[PDB]
Amino acid sequence: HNQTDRTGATALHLAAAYSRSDAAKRLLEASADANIQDNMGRTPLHAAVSADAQGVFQILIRNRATDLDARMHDGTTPLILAARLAVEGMLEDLINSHADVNAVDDLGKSALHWAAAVNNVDAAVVLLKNGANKDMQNNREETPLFLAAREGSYETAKVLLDHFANRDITDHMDRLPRDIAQERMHHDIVRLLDL
């Protein structure tokens, strides 16, 4: 019931991963724990996001006891995961359900850092519109703009610059976003930063 398999997956994890809406509801009605962590610290909500299981995702976010800010064993939250995976809708649904927009994983990266690293531009816009700290530094003193520049995420770097993200905040080695873009040969980003 709250019994797990070899991967630490409960029945509720499996419903998430397999898109079993009804099984998910019966489990939750029977007081099944919504926040049990599997071997990687994923709760069923992490699993619903990874599986892009829209039905179970909606059931889990509607359930008041679900921890929308639950952390995997590397501090990854459902919001960071949705940002990284670029699944449709879930990112904005979590935000509208009051997930913490500025929570960070264990390396100090927020959902916006990750939207920038993977060039998930729609996620960055939604995050920025809902109070994401555009100039947040992670443990390595990297801002989302720094990561965009490093990864060649032109479209997301442009959204951040249009939101007046601070282009002079350097990383732990004193590198500007312009510097890391130049080192990594992202000439288009260098040009964008020079405008």
Added chain:
Amino acid sequence: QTDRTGATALHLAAAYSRSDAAKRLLEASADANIQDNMGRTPLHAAVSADAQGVFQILIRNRATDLDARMHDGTTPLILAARLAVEGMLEDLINSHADVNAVDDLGKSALHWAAAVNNVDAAVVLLKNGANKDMQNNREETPLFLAAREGSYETAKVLLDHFANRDITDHMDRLPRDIAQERMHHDIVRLLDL
């Protein structure tokens, strides 16, 4: 809905303990917090009907406002306190309802429990951080209200919680004075202990 009393389908599911209906409406994105003519949401109606199945469905639904106010400021917790329904007041508290919210007369759920001598609710409320000394608009503490209404069991609870017996109403009456006035002999002697 809404209908003639201002009841949506979800109010009616609450009033008649229809759990299947309530679940179906919520999963179809019905607004959990529509007020009827008296300012009741489906959650107030479930408390009033003592509808345990629908009550549980509603409180497990994230978007339900557990602290919703009727037109006199009555919250679900206050209503559960007044009515002395089983289970519901504790479940609201455990779901993080505001223990210290007040109706428009400034009465908290603890004020009400004292007034109706709902001693179990007083114990639960005090255990979860209720202000034992909170004064309402008329400057009445829950101890004062227990004293006035002859609520021995609840006045004992609040005294055991070191409620301040010296706090007076707007006419500067002690709980001891009002018990004396209303000839609640058990309370006066309770208070002289």
